[PDB]
């Protein structure tokens, strides 16, 4: 309520809504494309890179742990992304200066859990999954 | 070994007329809009079709200089599948006592519902007569009539109450904070009340103003009875 309800006010409605839609956060990222330019991804679900070097990443309080991530440079941008490594002992199955395949966490822009500064994780080392390396139904191909 | 109950000696006038069995239905009581002040009156007319469905058992607690003190507050629904439902809240120090306090209170607050048809008749009403609402502090419900066999299309909370009411078909929609279910269920119950308090063209013919049971059966009550 508190607004026009004319019969010839189609212009004053459809131009107002087209302006006040930009104050929404979601809409403003989709249509400016500043999302694409700023992201290390092109909007692609995955991406591929080459390892730079292992790191240890401290946890946010209350939790205290060391989380053993990696840091990676990409093939098609040359810029750098810091990527989590999953389950116990899977760090060892990643060896420095090889290729890897990365993927987002599942929150689509934001850092997940108690680990800060990480927005990406790792899925395949070299056409072989972290699962089959971990479980033992496959072996290192080298 | 030793046998025989003796339970329920009325201290209430209305209770005594039921115990002597000169009031033959609850429908007389509701027509004069009397209070019901005892929980055995209802449990005399019914008691072999009333089920209970304990919704939530919620803690609350205040603060004092010795720390916390917690009391348990539970909601308990009640209704037979012929048109009578009720609802009650109660709190107590412990759990079982609060539940049993609510099963009493819900019987006390029991009311009838009015059921109606969609757009045509084939006997036995299956849905709500008219499109009504009911609000309890920023929660509201919009019970909308529905055709046969659609089922009750609602959230889990009102689906209890409406199913016990015998209202088998309904469309609904909520507005506001339904997370705090104490509002949500009381607002549903509010809506279900309004069904006989909504004027329809059927009811436009004038009532005959028949004399009250209080008046007619007063002859037995001139002894010492109150």
């Amino acid at each position: 309520m508190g607004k026009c309800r004319g019969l010839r006010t189609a212009r004053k409605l459809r131009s107002h809504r087209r302006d006040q839609k930009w104050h929404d956060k979601q809409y403003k990222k989709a249509h400016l494309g500043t999302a694409l330019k700023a992201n290390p991804f092109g909007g692609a679900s995955h991406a591929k890179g080459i390892v730079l070097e292992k790191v240890g990443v401290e946890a946010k309080q209350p939790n205290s742990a060391i989380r053993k991530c990696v840091r990676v440079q990409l093939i098609k941008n040359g810029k750098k992304i810091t990527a989590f490594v999953p389950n116990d002992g899977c760090l060892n199955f990643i060896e420095e200066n090889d290729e890897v395949l990365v993927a987002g966490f599942g929150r689509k822009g934001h850092a997940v859990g108690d680990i800060p500064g990480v927005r990406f994780k790792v899925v395949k080392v070299a056409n072989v999954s972290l699962l089959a390396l971990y479980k033992g139904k496959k072996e290192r191909p080298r | 070994g030793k046998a025989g109950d003796k339970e329920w000696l009325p201290v209430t006038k209305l209770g005594r007329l039921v115990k002597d069995m000169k009031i033959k239905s609850l429908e007389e009581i509701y027509l004069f809009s009397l209070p019901i002040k005892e929980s055995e009156i209802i449990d005399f007319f019914l008691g072999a079709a009333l089920k209970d469905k304990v919704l939530k058992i919620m803690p609350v607690q205040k603060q004092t200089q010795a720390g916390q003190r917690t009391r348990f507050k539970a909601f308990v629904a009640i209704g037979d599948y012929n048109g009578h439902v009720g609802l009650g809240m109660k709190c107590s120090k412990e759990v079982a006592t609060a539940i049993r306090g609510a099963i009493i209170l819900a019987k006390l607050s029991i009311v009838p519902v009015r059921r109606g048809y969609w757009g045509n008749k084939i006997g036995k009403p299956h849905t709500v007569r008219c499109k009504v609402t009911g609000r309890c502090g920023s929660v509201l419900v919009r019970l909308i009539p529905a055709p046969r066999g659609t089922g009750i299309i609602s959230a889990p909370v009102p689906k209890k109450l409406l199913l016990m009411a015998g209202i088998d078909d309904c469309y609904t929609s909520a507005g506001g904070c339904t997370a705090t279910l104490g509002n949500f269920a009381k607002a549903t119950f509010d809506a279900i009340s309004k069904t006989y308090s909504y004027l329809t063209p059927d009811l436009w013919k004038e009532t005959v103003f028949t004399k009250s049971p209080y008046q007619e059966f007063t002859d037995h009550l001139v002894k010492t009875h109150t």
Binding site: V55, G56, I66 | -
Partner: protein, 109 residues
């Protein structure tokens, strides 16, 4: 602290004294260089390599590690620059270790 209260709801204490791992493989003795804030801290290892030390759970606010003094540090399996604190000692324990001739004889307390 200077007495106070609310310091007994929780497990007094103390070090009933005790004894004495080392080094182990990537798990060796260092000396505090500085004393940063936030939480982390600096500590040069006794071998010659520098490193930056990090605090460990529990030892958080359960044990204060003033500036200057020996302390037990694990090395990260892969990382050089950052390393991970363990198990501190006592100043008496550190001078007994020095007298034994197991850590290098270079730092004073």
């Amino acid at each position: 602290k200077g007495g106070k209260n609310r310091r007994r709801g929780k497990n007094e204490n103390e070090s009933e004294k005790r004894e004495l791992v080392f080094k182990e493989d990537g798990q060796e003795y260092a000396q505090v260089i500085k004393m940063l804030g936030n939480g982390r801290l600096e500590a040069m290892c006794f071998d010659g390599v520098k490193r930056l030390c990090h605090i460990r759970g529990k030892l958080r606010k359960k044990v204060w590690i003033n500036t200057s003094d020996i302390i037990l540090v694990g090395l990260r399996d892969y990382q050089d620059n950052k390393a991970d604190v363990i198990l501190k000692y006592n100043a008496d324990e550190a001078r007994s270790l020095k007298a034994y001739g197991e850590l290098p004889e270079h730092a004073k307390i």
